[model samples]
Target: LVPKLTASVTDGAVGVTVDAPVSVTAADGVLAAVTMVNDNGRPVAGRLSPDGLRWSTTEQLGYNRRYTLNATALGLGGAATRQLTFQTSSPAHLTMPYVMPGDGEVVGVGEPVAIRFDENIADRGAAEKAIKITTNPPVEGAFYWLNNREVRWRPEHFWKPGTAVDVAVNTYGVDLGEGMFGEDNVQTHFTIGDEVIATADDNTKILTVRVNGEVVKSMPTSMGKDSTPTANGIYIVGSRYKHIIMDSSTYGVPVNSPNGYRTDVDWATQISYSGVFVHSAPWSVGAQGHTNTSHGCLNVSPSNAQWFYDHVKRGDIVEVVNTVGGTLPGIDGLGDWNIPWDQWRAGNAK
Candidate 1:
């Protein structure tokens, strides 16, 4: 019966990394006990199957470490025993992974799942193939490379509200080229929430608010003058404030200059990382619906601005259309929706 025991890894086996629960097992009987130890003879913890046929290490093996396993079982005839000794190989370089849209956080529909590598990846295709992103109810999407070290995945459309997204990075021992291998595997999850959208038309100089696809409010607005045209395309709302001291210098325009000025603003809602906002400029009440004014912000009456501030939250969608400038990249303000579904699936860089 002892001879009938199967050995997965044998003595003196070298250059090995554990997946999980490393132990020897009996082929035809109940396992009685299993033990694993380090080179110093310290016991390694593992879990044994109730029937005693299998055992697994609680932790994955450390890099470049040697381990020994001894297992015993009762076979059809009598007692059985087996042992395994192996070493984990050492790689010349290691790679670390960073993930965005992290675990349990609620974000706007436009937020894409981002995976960034610390080291440059030579095999983009293989590195991407090793990652897994799944959504409850199964959303369709594709992964695209932002650069040699960064890749992001976005849905063909805005994520379905309340969808659950799970990400798994199984890169342990994965070759990323140039002798760099992954050091570990990780998993994270997040969820999408109810649809929140704000639609602003530079053509008509007005703003409309929508929730769950239903129109809730519409108000007059004033945007960037022709000299400083507003950008068109979808954006995401960000940090907000009830009152902020507007400064032209932040965007490279100096105060007291021929075309620059500063003033106090009310109910400002940041819409882009590019210093753009949907904020109050009530002094332009006459121009709110008639024409564009202010440098490039979407201007509105103090009342309208306050209302917007109260309703919109981070990750909400903001669409500005019929303008001279195109919307900024997704990283700027969640403009991922600006890219067409086909182009996104094709993984084109903007």
Candidate 2:
């Protein structure tokens, strides 16, 4: 009579487990043992369960490595075998962080360098390790992390009017967080523009426009009414454009007769955000720099607005001080000068 036997294999701590059922008759009494083997066909160490239904072995495995197992059982006059394969977990890889306005991205005097990342980084220390900023005149500088994915760096004050700045982000192996990594390092070089004088004053009800630090012209302006005043603080000229149309609809000013300006005016110079601009106001020159008349816009002479439009470029710095308005949002294109230097630095601090 022929005896029956079966076998199987599975993964284990250090290696694989080999289990099998064994039985034998007097005709094949020598077939009562079982053995397990690895991929190399070498016998493996194993232990059988009390019920003879399972087996196990303890062996240290390498991370990200794979291995195979085989088992054999003998009974009566026949033998049976089985084999399997599997892999182990691997360790996390570290990646570096990077910043934009690289060590060589040209920047205007009014522009602030912004750094961004693809992933949220929890390790500020590691993030800071890869960033470096330097200037020719050596001004006081600081960096603040806006969020896990974004950061900005600037001097304690604006760069010395017209200086060159060098920036670098050597984030090639920075481990950000959650097993994420930075791609590579970056370098950018940029020059600051000549002194552009853009100033705002509540006492005067106007924002003065200047080029090369000289007051070339002034614009009549109006700020938010007593209820919504424009903020006052030093700000950089973030952007500029010519011939933009002012719409009362942007500020929720309806087209009704008693409520909104309703009319679209030709805008020549857009210097800040929050609907404040150095634009042409052919209708309100009388209130320019004299009375708080506008809905929160800095109205300028048509000629002055044209001249400012001709010269100011993105990244130019503007100083808007002594206003009842709180501060402008640091959003792109808006010059909310209400944010203090300390607070701004703290906002970007890592």
Candidate 3:
């Protein structure tokens, strides 16, 4: 009787998944030898069944490459040899994740887990599915794609103080469509620090700060002037600097104009991408609590600003209330909290 060989992948196949199993089976005989090799002639690892009737690949293949599999089986009359050649998928674009709150860092309670990709993701659902998050306290969260290359996840509410978070983007073999493939897997670990929050009330011109649910400070502040009233919305503390050069020209207002000026400032904490910050302004100290007279910033006494900067953590929550300016858009800095939960979750990939 003649032995028949059956292979998983058809001969001359193209665009095969890298991790898909490659196997061969023999009928009416026992297998003698089965070998697989890549385009470079490097042998691929494989295993043969104890019954000597089947062989399969043991390791993953690489992208955009051709592979060959050869099998021989001993029949009653003679040995039969069969061969197959296939090409693994070639990605038009490769994407990988860059996670925030990086490994081993301590963040504030309102911090959202954010991921930015090197390449745009065509299939949002596939990209979201590749990421796995585990919280020490096991909080529930949902994924929201900020854009084609950015996605973020946040708990329904602020994270619990001291909560440990672990993130894994298992994208090594994920398919994101449009001939895009994930480049590699990535992971990160972080912890939530104290629950720090600061609220700037436009009505009273007061900046009140709380730590772990207790009032830490109630400092006077001067917010954006009438022309550039501070936007009312929740924000998350981002980068901090002990000293920085403040230039209105960066936000489109010319420094030479009467409304604009470049100055050196101290204890600046960023809260929005739209040039909103909590910083010291000794020039405006007299009007700090009594009036609003800043260029869309929360101006506080030098000492108070230094204190706030020293105590605030990245991802801490900051809110501006009762302002003439509209609510801060979600795209501004870490204003993720300003978005209603329903609206945020609605953007999630199915």
Candidate 4:
């Protein structure tokens, strides 16, 4: 008396989850053959165990798809067979995720890969599981939860020169459990351009930039005098401005406050969220690259600032050194790389 053959997902079953794997097993036998196909007669991709007792699908089933499974086995008792026909559940809700730094766009090495979902994700683990990332030169990285609506992946350090990265979220038809399903598969093919590694050393009163290990810009720079010191850490340039009005009230000090002042700035490229930039300050030309004399912004000659602005792009690295006792709270900014690798990896769910 041998156990009967069985189908994990019963024949004629409806409301079968899109995430569920279709499988068949011989309880007391070796499977001779298994054939599973979609409505189109396209074989459902799968694999069978070496002992031939069980078989399971390797590819995810499509939503609202009809599939038929035919399997047979040979046992000590006799030959056994099971045929199953089923339909995958259609999604109650579908969400599409959008990727930042659009495809084919070159960005600074410090840019973290970001993705936002159109709807709330009930299972971050499953969502992250469907995503894949691969780099040309192979750099180790980690994924961190920015919030329920978004996720990000960043390398342990700045990307090396000449790196091509591929990001793909093959989540179509994936069941995220709360009646939510992936809306579509998304992908981005982008690369890292020239290395814009900059160092603004207050001690020397100069800003130096290196491109692919060759010195590019070494110009006079003036930093904070004493009261409002610049943040010191590894910062990533976020955006640029050709002309703009900068005010103190934005950062919370009243305009009338003695320490507060407003000014028009040009060729400004933001390197931090707390409002720090390497920008033009003609009035401070004599002090730039020579003295520390501003309300905490890096003041550079107009010409030099323009040069820096044209070359700098999002994700470029800026290491601010010696800001007269400055500290960049590890709490924010694009300083995720500044964290140790082990610690960064641990930020993911257990």
Candidate 5:
């Protein structure tokens, strides 16, 4: 009598999915040996059952590739061998990911692991599961989809200073749904710096900087005027520039409009995507700490602005209070902390 081999894929199968399990089970026999390899002769890793009744692949398969499988099983009478071959299908779209908080960079506690995909992800759950984030001290975090193409992960609270972070987006060969497959893997390693926070108060018109709970500097600042009050809420610094051209037209207000103007500013720290920044404004020096001026930015002297910019890094905190416009939305820049912890977790796909 000879053993019967039951395999997952039939011989000569074509257009097979990369994620399909490749396994073989022996009936009325115990498997003796099994070998699976691609056309290049590179072995495909697999695991054998403890009882020696089955063998299965443990590696991700490549797209549009052919694989050969050979298995030998022993029965009461003799040994039986079977061989098969199959080819995996090619995806219509290959999604590539861009991970941020770049490698070897140091960021503030408020930073999150942000990923932007070249193509919109149809299966958010599959994409989220493929991403692996390991913290040195082991922290719990959740993923929030800002959109189909953008997803971010962050802990419930700000990271502790000196925490080491490692990110691996192991998405190669992963099915992202809608005929889109992951193109390749991505990785990044970064560290969290000291807890640096800046606070702006509309009533006092003052901006105060703190490092690790210690006040370091205080500068007279002029917040947005009543007509265009600054939004009140917590914010995270996203970018810094030595010099930038401020334009109202970027946000739809034409340069020739009644409330529009374009000016070159130095030492700008961006806290929100909607044109909110803490920047030098020698034009508003007299109004600092005394009146509300400017559109929706924190206006400060050039020297103070430079000082603030030099002290902060990406992911640092910048909070505004006592403003009339509604609280800033969580989707505006690095405002992940603005969402409630419960809601943040609920946003996860898996």
Candidate 6:
């Protein structure tokens, strides 16, 4: 009897199902276990299915590698063999094509360079190796792994305003995990627009923003409530997103239809901490600085938020202070807001 084979995948495991033909005699029949071979010709362990129609295996496979399957079934008459070959899906070879505000993307003079990746990367070291960043006014730079797929690089401080900057990502042979590999290298060039003008003060209840030493706009904001007030210290605008869903559950806030704060907000810019941000606050304009209101967020008017969003670029400085609550740990790769300059410099393996 002919035997048919198929396979499926789940987190950390792969399920292979084998269907045996009814014509095969089952009298003391022995079903030879299936096995897998990787591109390197390494043998991997596998298991038999309970219904005699499937075989499952749990083996860690490298990214962008080919795999083959082979199996044999023994019946009353004799043993029949079958073999098949397949390859795991490759990871997306994301290149950092373009970063907003340009390379050396600057914000109020104090911001750090923010590098955003278009494709998610699995191996951060490989991704960092692909990235090449440099500035006209030479300064120490470092790259941080935000997550499995996202990473960012920045100098110890914001690049001098109007400095020329260059960035490159050579993902030619980067293995991003889960069968994904980088396809090509990408390079981008940009310049810092202007000087820094943002500050976070612990004594005052407001975040003062200036452009060229002039306070162009002053808006109210809310930090973490007494339990989770915003962190007080120097910070920089890492990255910005126009539209994002604001989920309360991320910060341990309860979720309910009426009282739940899980909703989509337009033009939200993340500044610092785990969930702290400077975003639109149509509901809390009155309570921004006077009353420490909000879930550890710096509330601002829609127009102010838009202006801040439009003008601010990654690497721009932002200071948040005068609060009792501690700051959130810096996120690797996402931005250089939380981590200090010295620590950020140490993370660079390349």
Best-to-worst order by lDDT is 5, 3, 4, 1, 6, 2
- Go through the candidates in order and give each one's C-alpha lDDT: 0.78, 0.57, 0.88, 0.81, 0.89, 0.60
Which regions of candidate 4 are displaced past 4 Å? 1-95, 118-122, 175-180, 245-264, 291-296, 329-333
- The clash count of every prediction, one per candidate, is 5, 39, 0, 2, 0, 31
Q: Is candidate 2 or candidate 3 better by TM-score?
A: 3
Q: Which stretches of candidate 5 lie over 4 Å from their true place?
A: 1-61, 69-82, 348-350
Q: Write the per-residue lDDT of candidate 4 for residues 1-350, one digit (tens) a residue.
A: 55467878988898787645778888777888899999999998989999887899998778888999999888788887777899887888999999876899899888888778888888888888888998989988878765577777888778876899899987776776587988788999888987888998978988899988899889899988887777677887788899877787876777788887788899998876666788999999988867888877788999988998899888888888877755665435556566667876776543
Clashing pairs in 3: none
| Sliding window of 10 residues with minimal summed lDDT for model 4 | 325-334
Better of 1 and 4 by TM-score: 1
Best by lDDT: 5
Candidate number that wins on lDDT, 5 or 6? 5
Q: Compute the lDDT of residue 22 as modeled in candidate 6.
A: 11
lDDT digits (tens) for residues 202-252 of candidate 3: 889999999988998998999998997999989999889998898888877
lDDT of 5 by residue, 1-350 (tens): 77888999899998787655689999889899999999999999999999989899998788988999999999897888999999887788898999989999999999999988999899999998999999988899989987779899999999999999999998777888888988888999999999998999877888999999999999999888888888999898988999899898986688898778798999999988888889999999999999988888899999999998899999999999988878888887567788888998888564
Residue 339: error of model 1 in Å?
2.2
For model 6, what is the alpha-carbon lDDT of residue 330? 72
Candidate no. 4 TM-score: 0.69
- Candidate 3 wrong stretches, greater than 4 Å: 1-12, 19-36, 43-61, 69-84, 249-261, 348-350
Q: Which portions of model 1 show Cα errors greater than 4 Å?
A: 1-3, 7-15, 18-23, 73-82, 89-96, 117-119, 170-186, 238-270, 281-287, 301-303, 330-333, 348-350
Residue 84, candidate 5: alpha-carbon lDDT: 98
Root-mean-square deviation (CA) per prediction = 4.1, 15.9, 4.0, 6.3, 4.2, 15.2
